[PDB]
């Protein structure tokens, strides 16, 4: 079942970029974070990191994560994957490069694995809120209350509805197969990989190779040191370069499709109700800032609504064509009078 | 040959004048100001910048009063107390129960922040204004000069020599007292040395970064530790430098009126557009030639193609010309109406050619000057609907 | 230590210092143009304070900040208007 | 070229303190801090800790700590480091009794390393904030601009 | 509101006056930072009538 979508888990491998704030400054992580999704309702994120979370090598091990460390990677246990933001998340799935999580509401987003000698996080700015289903504009998913159509991203990851771009990555430099042959410039090569090859001097000039040497530069700061490597394929990301040969397919599935569920919502505690001639005076102890509305039902409809926050005491003047009023999520409530 | 002039003060405007030389062919002029700037004298007063309360180690005798000493050190505030019974993490520190007193004595020392962020107390003078000006009249078309304003020192740069100013307006945008801030610049009056109340602007004043001593009024006072634990206890106001940082108005440089902008410099005002400008210049005589080789353009008539009442030289006209020889023939209009952009027009026996300019007449009646030739073109303009130009180069408003 | 204050005068190990920060930048807002008068329809994503001033005689500054998306407006004089949206350089303008 | 400090190094040792808000209560825990410089603006605070950590006990090991337990000096690693805020911060770099670290605003400020048994930790009330250079009233440094 | 206006949700073709405009890329950084109008979606979805 878990492995009918090798469509990602083979033919995608992860790649590193640019983090913005990678441990302390700009570095280069592995994990760098891509396309936040803050637009569920419930406070779920999806985020899209430059790491391939779920399967091993081939096609096991979902509790295991792989990264790229330099030009090879080297998949292990997701003994200590956090994301975190202005308080600490909690994760719910993780698949491809993309991780679902619950967060408090926050301003910044981070994101880290722990290889165990080192931390090896990322993180970006980009605010996350909480948007309350509902009128209710509460802060946290209460334990109980009336259910509303809410819209949130689902856990499952078996699903088809969107797919994105993983072309050939472009080339990559790796300066460390740039060792020295005594006295010359001297490129090695990952498996047979193509390394794109060249120096400022005139010398060898596309790079299509074994293990070559070069005959005229010396400085390993003025050769081109690349890696063609799309024996594996790479997601479409902004932050890699894109080799001008072509660019491939293999668009593979979304994991996690929004989808429009029913979250549990607050219910504001009920008003006490007070009257006087052609007068409803409503009494009104909210916990959290919820909306109260009201309507007549006479011609003029005369609305009037307003967030209240502070316990208040208002009153409504009650034509003998009636009155209705909707405080919260409560059902909506009419009356007549004398 | 000396011909004075009195020019408006713009940065981006010409002043394509024509020298009206007897016995010679006259000669244009092409003033232009590259820079205006002011650079007003100035005095620096103090700098204040936040502090830092270094509080040594407290003096804790265990059995006995010890009288404290009135120390030079800025803003010294030093207090005994007395009947304290301090622990430790090895302990209670004394056998006696009432004779321990602590000396603790506090003072003010600028913060190692204030190398690098520090406020600027300035008191100006009039000064002394500058300016780069660019001519390139006659043939040489180049000149690189920077000048003064006085109305004394002379400009002989490459063959032409000439004196600028005194200014119009004796208008500064900086006022009396001038305080700046690493950048920008805030017209703030700060009150004096050494007056500073606390927690407003100036809480510590400094005479300059150097400077070792300083005037420290921070309402610095200590008071006793609580439960009998070894620390020291100082209330103070907050830093009077960290106020008025997130509450200061605007700075001066998005405040000066006439398009004038500063710079952590001297403090010059640059393109401080106000008043004008008396200009004198002394022409020399070697680019004059003998008026009897000028060619005779007489007999010439001037028809407008298509003028727009707008700022842009929107402007254009074709001349009738009715010449004798070939050569060179400055064109200029003396009269502010109009202002041409075109500066030399070769002439051809019995030619036409256009020129463009700029006008803020419904109905321009401008003359226009030809190498000694005058000609009144006049004709009618049109308002544009889409105003977007650079910035007007007409600058000739006035009633229409 | 009633003794004395030995020496060990010690250096500050992290000094400030005066560097360059990146710092975050405004959309650009939608210019709008009227007859003598300046449209400047904007949607700030973080609060930004814009401060205008007039290149007359007379300054006429006006400093606020705004967080929601919001229209303002600003009458362009034949001296000319300048404008500072956010950190963006500052920008002038014409009239007619 | 780090060993030209050895007057930090060597002529200083480690020191323990009144900490206000050690843990539960006010103890006496060996990483008392004082004066938390959090003057900048792209949110890094410097904090000096009455630990003094830096090399070990002799002149080696810049990855360790040396805190004072009891009447002696114990020098171990600094595995478990904390600084935090209304958020967690994240350590840059420390030498002698100063750590170098930039964290959220926030209205208290801990430190806390860990010796393997023990929590160790420390804390104090002191108000942090950051607005960016600029009229950007940010929250964070972005990515570009 | 309407800044994205699609003919249908299936609609290939659509429209989509949002000001963005690319910028320089900062510190020789391999990135695409792009300077975007906030979601006009967004808005009035905070600030809808009744
Ligand atoms: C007594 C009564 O009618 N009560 C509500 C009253 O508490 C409130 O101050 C007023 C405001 O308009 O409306 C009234
Ligand atoms: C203060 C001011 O002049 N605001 C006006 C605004 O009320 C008007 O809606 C807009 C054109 O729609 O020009 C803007």
Request: charged content about 20%; some cysteine.
């Amino acid at each position: 079942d878990l492995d009918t979508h090798f469509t990602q888990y083979k033919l995608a491998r992860p790649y590193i970029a640019d983090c913005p704030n990678c441990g302390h400054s700009r570095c280069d992580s592995p994990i760098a974070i891509e396309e936040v999704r803050g637009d569920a309702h419930a406070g779920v994120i999806r985020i899209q990191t430059s790491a391939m979370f779920g399967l091993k090598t081939d096609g096991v091990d979902l509790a295991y994560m792989s990264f790229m460390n330099g030009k090879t990677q080297k998949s292990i246990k997701i003994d200590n994957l956090h994301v975190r933001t202005s308080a600490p998340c909690s994760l719910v799935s993780h698949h491809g490069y993309y991780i679902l999580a619950q967060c408090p509401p926050g301003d910044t987003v981070t994101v880290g694995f722990h290889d165990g000698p080192n931390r090896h996080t990322c993180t970006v700015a980009h605010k996350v809120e909480f948007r309350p289903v509902g009128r209710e504009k509460y802060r946290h998913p209460p334990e109980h209350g009336v259910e509303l159509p809410c819209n949130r991203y689902t856990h499952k990851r078996a699903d088809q509805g969107h797919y994105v771009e993983m072309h050939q990555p472009g080339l990559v430099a790796d300066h460390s197969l740039l060792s020295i042959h005594s006295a010359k410039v001297k490129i090695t090569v990952p498996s047979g990989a193509q390394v794109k090859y060249y120096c400022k001097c005139p010398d060898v000039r596309e790079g299509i190779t074994s293990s070559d040497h070069t005959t005229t530069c010396t400085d390993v700061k003025q050769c081109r040191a690349y890696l063609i490597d799309n024996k594996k394929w790479v997601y479409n990301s902004g932050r890699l370069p894109r080799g001008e040969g072509d660019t491939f397919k293999g668009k593979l599935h979304v994991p996690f499709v929004p989808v429009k569920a029913k979250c549990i919502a607050t219910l504001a505690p009920e008003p006490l109700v007070e009257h006087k001639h052609r007068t409803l005076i409503l009494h009104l102890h909210p916990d959290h800032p919820t909306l109260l509305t009201t309507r007549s039902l006479g011609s003029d409809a005369n609305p009037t609504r307003q967030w209240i926050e502070r316990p208040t005491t208002v009153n409504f003047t009650v034509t003998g064509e009636g009155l209705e009023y909707t405080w919260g999520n409560h059902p909506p409530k009419r009356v007549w009078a004398q | 040959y000396e011909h004075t002039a009195v020019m408006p003060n713009k940065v981006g405007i010409p002043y394509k004048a024509l020298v009206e030389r007897p016995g010679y062919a006259p000669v244009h002029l092409q003033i232009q100001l590259v820079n205006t700037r002011i650079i007003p004298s100035t005095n620096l007063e103090y700098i204040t910048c936040k502090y830092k309360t270094k509080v040594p180690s407290p003096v804790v005798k265990c059995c006995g009063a010890t009288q404290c000493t009135s120390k030079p050190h800025p803003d010294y505030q030093c207090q005994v107390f007395t009947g304290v019974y301090p622990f430790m993490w090895g302990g209670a520190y004394c056998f006696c129960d009432t004779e321990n007193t602590q000396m603790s004595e506090a003072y003010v020392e600028r913060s190692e922040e204030c190398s690098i962020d520090h406020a600027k107390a300035y008191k100006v003078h009039t000064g002394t204004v500058q300016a780069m000006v660019n001519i390139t009249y006659g043939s040489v078309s180049w000149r690189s000069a920077d000048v003064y304003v006085n109305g004394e020192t002379p400009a002989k740069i490459g063959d032409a020599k000439l004196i600028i100013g005194p200014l119009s307006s004796a208008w500064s945008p900086f006022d009396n007292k001038v305080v700046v801030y690493g950048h920008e610049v805030y017209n703030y009056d700060f009150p004096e040395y050494g007056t500073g109340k606390a927690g407003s602007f100036g809480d510590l004043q400094s005479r300059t970064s150097t400077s070792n001593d300083l005037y420290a009024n921070t309402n610095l006072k200590l008071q006793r530790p609580q439960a009998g634990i070894v620390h020291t206890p100082f209330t103070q106001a907050p830093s009077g430098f960290e106020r008025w940082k997130r509450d200061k108005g605007a700075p001066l440089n998005d405040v000066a009126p006439f398009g004038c902008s500063i710079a952590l410099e001297p403090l010059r005002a640059e393109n401080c557009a106000v008043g004008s400008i008396p200009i004198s210049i002394d022409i020399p005589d070697a680019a004059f030639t003998r008026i009897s080789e000028t060619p005779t353009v007489s007999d010439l008539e001037c028809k407008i193609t298509e003028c727009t009442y707008a700022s842009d030289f929107g402007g254009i006209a074709t001349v009738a010309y009715k010449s004798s020889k070939a050569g060179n023939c400055p064109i200029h209009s003396p009269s502010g109406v109009a202002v041409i952009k075109e500066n030399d027009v070769t002439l051809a026996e019995s030619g036409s050619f256009t020129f463009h300019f700029s006008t803020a007449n419904i109905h321009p009646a401008f003359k226009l000057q030809v190498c000694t030739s005058a000609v009144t073109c006049k004709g009618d303009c049109k308002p544009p609907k889409d105003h977007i130009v650079d910035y007007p180069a007409q600058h000739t408003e006035s009633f229409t």
